[PDB]
Amino acid sequence: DEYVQELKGLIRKHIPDRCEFAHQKVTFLSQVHPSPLLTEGFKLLSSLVELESCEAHACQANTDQRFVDVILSDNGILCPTLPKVIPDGFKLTGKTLILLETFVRVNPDEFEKKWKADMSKLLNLKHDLQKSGVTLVPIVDGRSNYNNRFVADWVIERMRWLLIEILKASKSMLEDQEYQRLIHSLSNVKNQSLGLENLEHLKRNSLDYDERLNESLFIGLKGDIRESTVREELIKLKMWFKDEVFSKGLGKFKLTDRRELLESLSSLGAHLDSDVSSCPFCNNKLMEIVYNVTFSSVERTNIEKHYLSVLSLCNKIKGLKVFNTRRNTLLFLDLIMVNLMVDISESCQDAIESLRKSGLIVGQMVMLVNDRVLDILEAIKLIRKKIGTNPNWVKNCSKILERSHPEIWLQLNTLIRQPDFNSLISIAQYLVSDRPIMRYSKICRHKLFQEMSSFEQMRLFKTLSSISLSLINSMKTSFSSRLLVNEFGNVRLRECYAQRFYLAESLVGFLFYQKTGERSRCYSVYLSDNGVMSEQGSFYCDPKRFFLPVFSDEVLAGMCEEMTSWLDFDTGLMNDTGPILRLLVLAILCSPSKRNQTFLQGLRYFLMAFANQIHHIDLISKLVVECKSSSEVVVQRLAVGLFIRLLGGESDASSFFSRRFKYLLNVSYLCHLITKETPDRLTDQIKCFEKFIEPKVKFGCAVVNPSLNGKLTVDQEDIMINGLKKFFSKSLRDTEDVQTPGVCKELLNYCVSLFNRGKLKVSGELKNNPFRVVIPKLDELGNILSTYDKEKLVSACVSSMAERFKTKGRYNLDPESTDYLILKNLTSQEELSLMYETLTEEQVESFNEIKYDVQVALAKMADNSPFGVMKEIRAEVSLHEVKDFDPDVLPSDVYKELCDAVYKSSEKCNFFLEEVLDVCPLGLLLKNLTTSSYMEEEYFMCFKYLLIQGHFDQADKLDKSYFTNAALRNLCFYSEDSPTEFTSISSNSGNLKFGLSYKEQVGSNRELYVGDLNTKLMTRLVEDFSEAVGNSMKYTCLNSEKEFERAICDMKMAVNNGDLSCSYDHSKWGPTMSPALFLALLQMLELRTPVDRSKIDLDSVKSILKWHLHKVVEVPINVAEAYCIGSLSEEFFHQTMQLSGQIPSHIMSVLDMGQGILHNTSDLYGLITEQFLCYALDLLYDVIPVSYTSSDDQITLVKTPSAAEWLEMICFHEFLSSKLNKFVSPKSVIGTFVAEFKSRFFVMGEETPLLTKFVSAALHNVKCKTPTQLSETIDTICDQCIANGVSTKIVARISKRVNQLIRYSGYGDTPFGAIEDQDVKDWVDGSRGYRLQRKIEAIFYDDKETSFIRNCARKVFNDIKRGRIFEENLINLIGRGGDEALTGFLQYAGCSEQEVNRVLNYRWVNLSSFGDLRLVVPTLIKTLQSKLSRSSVASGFIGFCKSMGSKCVRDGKGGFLYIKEVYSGINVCICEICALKPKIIYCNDSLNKVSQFSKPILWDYFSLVLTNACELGEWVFSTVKEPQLNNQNFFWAVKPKVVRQIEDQLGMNHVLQSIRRNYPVLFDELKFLDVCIALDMMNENLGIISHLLKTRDNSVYIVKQSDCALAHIRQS
């Protein structure tokens, strides 16, 4: 009370501005007392922050701070019996209301848990407030500091600084655990490195449950077992094991009996029991269509370009919506297209016959707008129907394309051209062709693929590429795109979407489909040979899994030719295995599924099991998958017939087993061609949760919803402690219970107590001791928007709009500005469609849901006869509105198709309007928003708007002055959710939540738990602890390149030595083990630091693995509704409904181990226990093994004295590893021929190239931002691919494919582009700079126009190098431009201006000159800030091609334009320059109209030669010389051979040289580096320093002899 008089004058510097200040201040001067001074003189800050955040949004300052029931009861509103919660602000006008909260948390640790609990308190309120007749927008002001306006950040930090003595004076003069959280809440902006040392100054109380945790978990652990008693125990255990259960034959491992594996394989995959056909085309519904396409074409235009130009103009004119509804803005340009069709029909004699039938339109068909086939006569109805609706229709709808318009209409007269109907009948009566049929749901004649020549086998892949491109660009159709006609096996197709694909000059194909979107469609493929339509099938498949063959005839044909040319040891076997593998690749491409993907994943385990000498007994029951269709039976017969073809022969058919293993290993990794996108996510989250919970309830530990804050109930306590001592029981001498998840505590004691002595090959030494915004909700991971975000941006839009229209009294909205704010904060009609089409279908329908409930909440805001009984109201309509309670999720399977239309087809009343009314007054959307589907084609959307229309939506207080447990939530900054006093089961804030998601692994989905943010921190603590432990450990490899490379080297020399070298694995490493096991391991670890030779305290790791033992794993909300419809997990959720009927949304268990959560902490366990097993096998079976560990995959390389007669040892190792819940998977294979580790397979004398995984990596993951970045990333992937020595043919064909992917996107071709074809040596010698140098100097095939500029580069390089300076200040000359800098360098190196005249005409046209290709600072600063700071593939490529053909490229003024518009400002400059390479090289005068993009190829070539003088060189200046037999399949290792004449470790030697380059760029956000650091800031196509500070990352290239000896030479 020595500064209590100071506080009357401290807060006296505040004018009583509002009612929240003077009413609090008049009671302040009337009492000098520290007991209300820390509450009522301290809640004024919280009230001021609350009033400021109420002043931020729309709000009424509730000074009473009362309930939600009483805040609805101001006027006459009946009470809906609300849950009793307290808001921090209300704003009620009309029939909507805004609940706004105000909380501030200074750290992100408890910023998100209070936000989640607050928004879950706001989302558990909508289900009872929605039924009252009102929807709310739950907004919150989540903060991290104090940013008020009534104070200005100069007194409120002194409200916690000068007041720090008065609460200590209260605690010294006059509460227990509410004191330290009030200090932790009033902290500053903290640089708070909370390590494990935090947990020391937490409280550590007891619950009388931790004692029984220790009684269940720590009794049998002593850590004091002598070194001789372990030997005397294990020798008696081996004497038990060899005489007991190995001699009676319960071994998990046998001797492969190599004749029998092929018989079990023939019984395994070759479905002779099934009724499938032997023809692959008849059984697959798409190989038949590919066969019918490619064998109707092998045996055998001014109006066309005008029609395609007006088609592109129609595509440009549709995406504006100037016709106020989505119905006439399709039919009007349908009328434009049919008028242009009848105009071209009146142009020439044979025009619609010769150049249209053979081209774009076929018999009774007119191609148009949204790739739509229309079959013309329907328009002859509809336009006539339109003149039934509007007789004087084309009188104002043409002038609205004149005014309020683009105002440039390049149509001839077709706007006002009322079509002559008799002429259209005459043309439509001419085209007499069958209507299209689209088949849903015998004899065979398909010419036997093994017998067909290799010329037409290429045609199958080429037509598969054409049809697959037609599938991939079916996402290019717009995703709203409502048709004109509604709508069972065989449909005579009225009008459909249709992609095209070319085969020759005469014939085009088609691809017909009805539905827009990205999911699996019922496609239908017709050809048109000379205009005749011909049916060739109709398949039902998913398009986005066909990005692999989309331009890769040559790539897949080349890798099949390579993979067949690996078999040059038998000629007839090669010619037999050629077409069967090519058919296999065709079947896998043409039918990408998950089940055949999983089967081909199992084939490498079968190949190792046939390869090695010992394999597990229970793999054949796992290698087989149940074929869902007859399509998977085809590939499962083909691959098994291939394996029996070249493994089981009548002779000794295992002669060259290395090449056979290589070939079959790539047959099994040819799995990877199938796209790992898991065709539906909701049937994959089911399998993820089922894989989560099958061992958990098989063992019996899964519980129902815990309390989420600390405590467990007594029954949960009992089942938890019973699962604990069921986990730890597992006595060492019963040979049964060998698959049950748990650890033998007695042998775990032997393990940790022999680890305490220095007798393992690892030890607990522990050098340098380890003691040193939008967040999702955990109920839904793997999705694109949380339930929070899906109302967070709704809340942002409604809060932004609720102030802007009441500035004057407008009371309306703009129907495009209400589609702009969502479309901004998620990702003026050009302004909408510019970034509307940068989405995915899931994002489109999420945008539609957000537009729905935003327009509902806005329509409710200004709000101040259902007896049309054909069916009953309360039996159908009100029943469906009360069962689901939501008009939003009213399904389409509960009703009929026509009843949605006839309830829509009621007469005109006060619920509708006509004249549309795009002015849209707010609150009159009740009659406006519904009529936007009464005049438009959809019906059920109007049905849901009509259902939401007609109201079918329905002194003690002096002692209690301090903040006690009953006074925790009075303030806004109090932070009740802080880590304050942790129990042995929680952390006083939460209960260690996690989530469920899947990894999208290739064969089987790895599950992946997204942790909560506090749990991310508490996970990273133990993770960094274990990483610093494993740094001292010598046989781990999860982080180290060093020990993984030593494992590689040891593995190579052991397979060369012929040592038996295993390859284990672990079945369910995640879902089996428990953190209680980690407690039982850490209890007796010593970790004696070399600083202080003493057992360190592990209680900072044990008292947080006790929190990971009790983790509240969430469920997906999409599996709590997929198990609510109606399979042992489906039995589990339906047997706990007979229990306590709350939804089982949470699971706490003993055995969890989050995959990737406790990864390295399990790696220390799987190192310590594995070295225990490696020491046991050292003594018991007198070998000297050495074992590595990657925490899921292992290898125990075993030396042998003096054949696999030591099955004893290996079965006993499996038994002991089963007793320590390291359950050896049936995937594990052990023997002296093949040793895998982390999918890198070693054979004697060589290494498997493993081609198809890297080829399928290069053909997939085509990430698309800019083609510079795209061919940066794919050049990196081709570098990684040719590091393994695939060929230079396959990499060149991948280069052709990626260059065609660029060229198909409308970018055209550029001299940088993708890297070139026939690139034979530039991978070893050279980064991307040298390859672009090679591509630019390969345009000049004479090498006369480039030797002069290389001599100029020599003149610059000899001047700039060491020993001399010669104007190192080239900082400013390069940054001016590309033209004048090249002229200055060419005149400083010394020549005339005639060389300037003859060089500076070679000008490539640029597109990323003034900026980048905007399809939503250089790459230098981006790479330096990426260094210094520390969703399918096909639907990304289509969103790339859709946003590149649009308005992307920029000019010098503020604005943008098209790429074809830039390529149209062009001329022809025949004489020796423009015809040197066509549409690549130009004249200076040929680019006269568009000269702002004409940058030189010689300047960029000069920049590349100076860069390849920096990064390497003294040989990049020489002339490319003339190079000059050996075996085709003899590859060998080459060295990168690089002379980088700079000083290394450039991480700091370029950051400090950016002051000399660009000082304000570093401000706001050596001797040789400086000349080639200004060459990279000005352009993008160089990338100089990305291959300087980083390393090559491979530097171990193996290449073939034919791709290295045949390669060129460039000597100095």
Closest to 1285 measured CA to CA, from 1315, 1314, 1324: 1324
Alpha carbons 690 and 1269: distance in angstroms, whole number: 40
Cβ(687)–Cβ(603) below 8 Å = no
Alpha carbons 174 and 167: distance in angstroms, whole number: 10
C-alpha separations of 518 from 471, 913, 1365 in Å: 10, 35, 61
> 143 pairs with which residues across the strands?
104
Alpha carbons 1064 and 666: distance in angstroms, whole number: 21
Q: Quick one: tokens of 501?
A: 């694909």
Report the sign of the C-alpha dihedral through residues 125, 131, 134, 137, in that order: positive
| Three-class SS of 23-71 | HHHCCCCCCCCHHHHCCCCCHHHHHHHHHHHHHHCCCECCCCCCCHHHH
Alpha carbons 887 and 1286: distance in angstroms, whole number: 58
Alpha carbons 466 and 455: distance in angstroms, whole number: 17
Q: Who's near 1246: CB < 8 A, 6+ residues apart?
A: 658
Q: What angle do CA 294, 299, 305 make, to 5 degrees?
A: 70
> 1187 pairs with which residues across the strands?
1196
Q: At what angle do helices 1267-1282 and 1251-1259 cross, to 10 degrees?
A: 180
Question: Can you state the percent helix, strand and coil of the chain, rounding each to 5?
Answer: 40, 5, 55
Q: At what angle do helices 745-755 and 1075-1082 cross, to 10 degrees?
A: 40
Q: Quick one: tokens of 1194?
A: 């292992």
Report the sign of the C-alpha dihedral through residues 851, 852, 853, 857, in that order: positive
DSSP codes joined into one string, 699-726: HT---S---SSS---HHHHHHHHHHHHH
Cβ(1235)–Cβ(1408) below 8 Å = no
Q: What is the resolution of this structure in A?
A: 3.6
Do the strands 997-998 and 1060-1061 form a parallel or antiparallel pair, or are they unpaired? Answer: unpaired
CB atoms within 10 A of CB 415: 19
Report the sign of the C-alpha dihedral through residues 897, 902, 908, 911, in that order: negative
Cβ(134)–Cβ(96) below 8 Å = yes
Cβ(857)–Cβ(818) below 8 Å = no
- Method of elucidation: cryo-EM
CB atoms within 10 A of CB 348: 13
- Give me the count of residues in the chain: 1612
Pinpoint the alpha helices (H) of 1283-1345: 1290-1304, 1328-1337
- Using a 10 angstrom Cβ sphere, with 0-12 exposed, 13-18 middle and 19 or more buried, the burial of residue 396 is exposed
Q: Identify the H or E element spanning 104.
A: strand 100-104
Alpha carbons 400 and 918: distance in angstroms, whole number: 14
Q: Which residues are annotated as a binding site for Mg(2+)?
A: 1193
Cβ(470)–Cβ(501) below 8 Å = yes
Alpha carbons 638 and 655: distance in angstroms, whole number: 23
Cβ(376)–Cβ(428) below 8 Å = yes
Is 777 in the active site?
no
Q: What angle do CA 329, 333, 338 make, to 5 degrees?
A: 145
Q: Who's near 1176: CB < 8 A, 6+ residues apart?
A: 234, 1213, 1216
C-alpha separations of 1261 from 25, 586, 594, 872 in Å: 65, 21, 18, 54
Please identify which of the residues 114, 252, 1222, 1289 carries the catalytic annotation.
114
Q: What angle do CA 1371, 1376, 1377 make, to 5 degrees?
A: 120
- Using a 10 angstrom Cβ sphere, with 0-12 exposed, 13-18 middle and 19 or more buried, the burial of residue 809 is exposed
**84: amino acid identity, one letter:** K
Q: Who's near 1514: CB < 8 A, 6+ residues apart?
A: 1539, 1541, 1612
Residue 1527 backbone class (left: φ over 0; alpha: ψ -120 to 50; beta: rest): beta
**567: amino acid identity, one letter:** L
C-alpha separations of 1169 from 594, 1176, 1268 in Å: 36, 10, 50
Q: What angle do CA 299, 305, 310 make, to 5 degrees?
A: 130
Alpha carbons 188 and 191: distance in angstroms, whole number: 9
Alpha carbons 352 and 303: distance in angstroms, whole number: 9
Closest to 1538 measured CA to CA, from 1601, 1575, 1591, 1603: 1591
Report the sign of the C-alpha dihedral through residues 1496, 1499, 1500, 1502, in that order: positive
Cβ(1056)–Cβ(1244) below 8 Å = yes
Q: At what angle do helices 1159-1180 and 1075-1082 cross, to 10 degrees?
A: 60
The domains found in the chain, sorted by start residue, are 4-192 (3.30.70.2640), 259-272+546-675 (no CATH), 287-453+476-534 (no CATH), 682-774+995-1227 (no CATH), 789-947 (no CATH), 1305-1600 (no CATH)
Q: Which residues are annotated as a binding site?
A: 50, 88, 101, 1193
CB atoms within 10 A of CB 1422: 11
Cβ(1087)–Cβ(1029) below 8 Å = yes
How far out from the chain centre does Cα 809 lie? 46
Q: Which residues are annotated as a binding site for Mn(2+)?
A: 50, 88, 101
Alpha carbons 464 and 459: distance in angstroms, whole number: 8
What's 1499's DSSP letter?
Answer: H
Alpha carbons 146 and 1313: distance in angstroms, whole number: 51
DSSP codes joined into one string, 818-842: TTTHHHHH----HHHHHHHTSS-HH
Alpha carbons 486 and 378: distance in angstroms, whole number: 13
